[PDB]
Symmetry: D2
Subunit: 510 residues, 4 copies
């Protein structure tokens, strides 16, 4: 209601309650702490929309049992078809890696190195058994060609740094920049450097194949560097996983610099904030995050942002005081879902963490100046002749003017709800579908609430359409989005099929 952003901030009140609807999606990692059909059932009630499986750890037998358990808890509530809530399954690839050899043969032995000490790095397979505080063997056979003189090298999550001093054929002579402890099989990161590793490793061709067979909703693709890498993943999923959404993880200088070509090839972005903060300096990661959420909002594409719980540095008191400034930040920046990794996989209090994500996410929607955003998105939209685009703009403007409580949209592929949601209307968008995969992927887009319809297809089509609209109005009242004698916008097509949405009706709630 404010004319300015400064007025808007000045009128924030702490003695007023929020709405029931929570626009932002919640993604939880599943490990040993929460693999069980009783823990799962309880997180679904707390507000979990997506379950992420991390294919770094475990085998294919172990994961298949987590998927089975995720589906069992989901289907428990498929008895009251009004209060059923769909839940997606995603798959994080391990992704292409560079690793050191075994230290002193054993693998449990640790050799400590001091600042200044020059060491040689060798690519020859003789030294892969015995690495000492003078010779390190790396798995990467092309490191010499990608590295330059003056380039830095990080060993094990940026604990040890090496300055490149002398560049030679099949060997590198390096000064030591930081002191730490070298263990066996530790990961290597090469800042600045435009790495030449393949798009998919030999291991991930097997995991991408396992996911298509296990019928997953989306794939998180690690270490994306160019638009050709995204194209590679799409070939491996084949024509049998052609519906599976590819989300590109951005996690080095190069993928940041070449962002615009990746965005175009992908189905959505993830800003892997831990990973990005090893390669990029800490105070620059802050800016790179806002730039990527900004560009994803302007293109109408979903952007996941991977967060953490923080605590105070000086700790005298006993309580943990789980500080969720990190989470609230992203909601405000205009992220579509937020992710919690460790806190839900191996941590001690999983339910408590989902309940925190929820309560923060809900409250922080108050502080956005939604009006400025909404106008702004409508200006950078092109004139077209596509009937569907024009229906959507009509629906969104009607909805301001009558202060409607919901926009109902019938959809098969999800595409018609996606066009409405790119404007960020105030009103919740209910999508009514029969396709069960479409109801799952809908959690990626901010402000869409999917409802799946189970009923048998009626004889007359006009009569089928009127059944799915009514279903949607019951589910709306049950979940408390509007009551009787309110106004809703309803959006549909003229014939059966995908791509024919063209009608907008303004109706009273029965």
């Amino acid at each position: 209601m404010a004319d300015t952003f400064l007025e808007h901030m000045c009128r924030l009140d702490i003695d007023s309650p929020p709405i029931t609807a929570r626009n932002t999606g919640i993604i939880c990692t599943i490990g040993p702490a929460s693999r069980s059909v009783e823990t799962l059932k309880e997180m679904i009630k707390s507000g979990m929309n997506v379950a992420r499986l991390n294919f770094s750890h475990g085998t294919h037998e172990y994961h298949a049992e987590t998927i089975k358990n995720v589906r069992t808890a989901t289907e428990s509530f498929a008895s009251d078809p009004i209060l059923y809530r769909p839940v997606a399954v995603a798959l994080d690839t391990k992704g292409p890696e560079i690793r050191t050899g075994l230290i002193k043969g054993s693998g449990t032995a640790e050799v400590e190195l001091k600042k200044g000490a020059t060491l040689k790095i060798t690519l020859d397979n003789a030294y892969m058994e015995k690495c000492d505080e003078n010779i390190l063997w790396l798995d990467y056979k092309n490191i010499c060609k990608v590295v330059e003189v003056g380039s830095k090298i990080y060993v094990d999550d940026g604990l040890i740094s090496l300055q490149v001093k002398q560049k030679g054929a099949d060997f590198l002579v390096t000064e030591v920049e930081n002191g730490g402890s070298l263990g066996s099989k530790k990961g290597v990161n090469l800042p600045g450097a435009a790495v030449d590793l393949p798009a998919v490793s030999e291991k991930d061709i097997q995991d991408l194949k396992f996911g298509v067979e296990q019928d997953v909703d989306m794939v998180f693709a690690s270490f994306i560097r160019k638009a050709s890498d995204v194209h590679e993943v799409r070939k491996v999923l084949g024509e049998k996983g052609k519906n599976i959404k590819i989300i590109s993880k951005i996690e080095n200088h190069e993928g940041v610099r070449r962002f615009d070509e990746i965005l175009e090839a992908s189905d959505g972005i993830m800003v892997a904030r831990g990973d990005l903060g090893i390669e990029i300096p800490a105070e620059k990661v802050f800016l790179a995050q806002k730039m990527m959420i900004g560009r994803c909002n302007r293109a109408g594409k979903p952007v996941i942002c991977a967060t953490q719980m923080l605590e105070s540095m000086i700790k005298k008191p006993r309580p943990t005081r789980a500080e969720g400034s990190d989470v609230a930040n992203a909601v405000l920046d205009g992220a579509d879902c937020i992710m919690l990794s460790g806190e839900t996989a191996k941590g001690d209090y999983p339910l408590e963490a989902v309940r925190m994500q929820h309560l923060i996410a809900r409250e922080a929607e108050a502080a956005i100046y939604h009006l400025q955003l909404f106008e702004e998105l409508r200006r950078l939209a092109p004139i077209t002749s596509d009937p569907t685009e024009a229906t959507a703009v009509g629906a969104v403007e009607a909805s301001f003017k009558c202060c409607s409580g919901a926009i109902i949209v019938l959809t098969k592929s999800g595409r018609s709800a996606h066009q409405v949601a790119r404007y960020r209307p105030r009103a919740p968008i209910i999508a009514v579908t029969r396709n069960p995969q479409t109801a799952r992927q809908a959690h990626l887009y901010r402000g869409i609430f999917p409802v799946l319809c189970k009923d048998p297809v009626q004889e007359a089509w006009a009569e089928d359409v009127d059944l799915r609209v009514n279903f949607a109005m019951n589910v709306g009242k049950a979940r408390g989005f509007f009551k009787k004698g309110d106004v809703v916008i309803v959006l549909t097509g003229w014939r059966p099929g995908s791509g024919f949405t063209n009608t907008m009706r303004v109706v009273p709630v029965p």
Copy 2:
């Protein structure tokens, strides 16, 4: 396409053609020069939308023959039901008046008066036969109570002015401010003064009754001063002329000062620019005109503006050079129709004058910054729960985005087309009706093109609706507003009746 008003003006090109559609209505007065079924037929082709009858002159027998002739020429073209054009009939009341008595008994005698000479004005009926250059008799019996000391009096269209010097009971002693010639039965105007004459004269109760019997489309009400005067006219039309549109003429200081209460009571305003320029000083009439067109645009109510042809003051060349700056001004100010009085009633070249109004009106729509106007009207619109208002805002926004070539609206009373037109969309608004009175009144609102449908009501209602939409698409292509494989917005209701408009479809032209 310009961001500013200054850019907009700088990009005007004189080597580019205009569109075929002319948004502004054209009202012509009918007198002896153009009472004939051959002259009438020819003005209808030139672009005449309304025929005005002036009830100052003629009798009731004479006017009834003009109406008959207007209808005959109209119905001549009702053979090709696609190219038929409806034509309204309006009625200008004579309106309440003050007149002087006979000069020197004869009525043809003229007595000239010089500056300074004090004369008496008497209300007593003895002097009504013989008025001299010392005693004038006026018809108004309450002039003494409404006039003050220092008030001016205008005799015969502001030729002679009288300053009030001495105020007495039943007599006025007046200095002479301007010299001229006094004739017999000349009209009196009293600037500043809040006159007490009745709302309708004894003559106009008879004319308002004649018009209801003759089935006229709208009534022009003279000398409106307050919102009670408008209410009086509405009682005389009764409940048998309850559809007849009342347009209030504004023609004195008081009606200007009390504008906002009249606007609310009326169906539209007319800015009688000749009349207003006798009572108000010449350089103030300019401002009073813009203020009233402004307020009528903001309220969503039509405003007629009565204009003239001008010529150059110093005339050496033989051509008349009909200067239409007066006409172009009003189109730009945001008038809905323009009127031409004398040029069409008694003048020598009637067709030429209608062809001029048309050509000016068309061209001057180029110079309006339509974008600034359109945004501006949408901001000063209130949030409601009325389904119809929300349908209309939806239709208008859809129409920008797809660059549609027309908005088709089905209507009975005209009300649904009126709501769309209050936004001033770029696209022409086609109204499809069966009601023949509704198609006539549609000429008052800027940018609506009425089409009347003659076909018999089909059995199934859904099938009736689809017939009137198609009719509208043929008439659209014939008149050349869009071709095949263009996009149109269509706007309709869910059941038969008035007040149920709620649906908006975006369709390809068949």
Copy 3:
């Protein structure tokens, strides 16, 4: 004070008085009706700022006596140095022309031609004595090369039109499009055609030389077609008339099409609306003015607009009712001065016409939405490092905030006042100069009020500056722009010379 343009129009009141200051300049033509030192003295009091001399008529002896008389009336008021008002002298060239030969030898004989009749046009000098209703001789020797087949020709101010039928070497065979009367020595106009006549005629090289010798303030240059024509005039004025302002008259399709290159070469534009309306169709002249005033406002260059008095076409009443819609239009479009030709040269009531221009000009400044204009001009201004530009922007913004009643500027060439005036501040701009030519040219720019200072240059410079500021504050209070204990902005430089303005002080009026 309004947020919108529609609110602004709705709040116009007819019961409120205007300010004393009149921003727009008034240019009067001087002929026989007003050549006299008594008529002149009286127009100077009425509000005449510039006296135009038309070098079509009269000789060099006759004009030199008008100039002498203009200066005598001016200097009459140079006794009270506070109430003195400076007055410019301008010079309208006759400009390059094409004329027909003598009809039937006599020159007073007239031959009438009917529609259809083919006539030959010959360039050979044998027929220049005897022109008949079959053979016309034209002065232009290159007409054959500039004209095309299908091109039209206008003879004597567009009375007769000729369609080109057959094109031959040294002869033209032409159909007759309009019928009229051919006289002797009538002017020829060639629409569309990119004419090849020289920039200055042999006569105007003599008049431009006479004006430099007579010390005129500005030259009006007729029939400008390209940026090379303007350069030609500048060479003829030499280096002795290098201060004289060149105003380019625009009066054909070509000068309109090539506008942007002329504007850059000129000191200001004149939109000769009579002349432009012979060559261009009547309803297009409307747009072409408007485009040119718009571009002149954006470039910060003055634009004169030449107007007329109009009267009603159907005239039954005795009063002339001098209709000044033409004049009010231009003030609103954003013209800097307005001109009146015939009404002041040969007409019967010269004083009455100057008093009309004044009263209209003053009143019509009420209806401009000055806020939208002002913001708009500030956005399309480039970042520079010029101290003077930054001083000016500072002065104008300070002046809003304190609601100052005047901006005082010391100037030698006029350039520092010109930079302030390009923003169109609300407050009057007083320019204080010693240069008498600078005080004269200041009437071209909208909103500058020049004051000339006659006092002897004081010894200490700082003390000189403080004398000219005070002079300016007396003249301001006398003319009633502000009273004692008001606030003014004062603008000056750090050293003597041109080009050093850099200081802005906010002072209380003493």
Copy 4:
């Protein structure tokens, strides 16, 4: 340079360097870790502007030795008068408190209480020696009157919560809501409750007196609840500390609800984020912070925000990874200085923490859309007649247009620099003063860089002014804000004294 906020975010680049100037102030707490003249000297170089002394701990003898040491390190650099940097001293009151009695007589004994157990709270002084797990003695004698039935009570930083069950005269019977350990002399907090404690305690009347004697720059006032409390502090400082800035700490529901009356009475606000998060729920503190920074920007008053360093909750790696999202947030919200408490008082690496605050603060100024802020502040500014206000608006607008590198302002009280800084110009504001207290307080306002001038007052005043301007231009070039042949705005008055600023000059850098 962007038209929108969404464009602005999309154009953020991570391969571009920041400016040298850091707009936001840095406040450090001084304890045992950094009381030494060698540690102090080193933090001054790192970017410390204010040294805070916490009057909870220590005696008056101990603090007087910290002040002495702060001044010694400051004055070390007063040898090169160009590179000297002034440093303020502030004083945080302990503030009014409620405390429990001794547990079981000893004071080191702890009694643990379980959920459910009803305990009595007694105000009678018999039980103040022996408190058990049934009877607690509180210092507050009016708790019964301020508390209601259903009100909660927090004991020792919200470890234990008590629900009020039964309300009686001089006793409270309370359910236990949370279990913990009760110690001796633990602080009590009463949410919702409009507490009646005095404005200043008996201890703080002594500390406020010590600070006036020790010549401190500003006083931080704890537990402000109403505009009368601020008035009380102002009386105790007397008329000998009338220049000392009062900053009101906001730290309960009441002070938040009554914010607008406090702001008006104060010299600036501090948002004590730790303290506020005990009384208010965690997810509401987030909003209350943005509301208060918003209101302080709109009123032109400085707002300090007290922050912390955070670390990741799940910690497997060895590095601390000092997460400064908390700090970056506040800079973006539009805080004027940021504070670090523990990290600098008792922590192990003080220098490292100041270097972190600096590096974050600098970088996060990149992401603000400074243009939208700047326009926004100029719209909500009132028209006045104050010369100084108009000079300031002039200076700020000039400065955009010429892209100046600095605004130099001469000031005695600081007031003229404060008016410029309330607009938030892009260019740094250098304030040149002789008053040493004025140079210290200047660190509170965002974007002002004070320079103190030590030279002797010259004879001619005009010549004094020209010396202080030049000093300011040397100091500007040394610190690298502009080089030779750049442009600066300079702002000064017409006579000596406070309150006469009226002149603005645009000068080239010598």
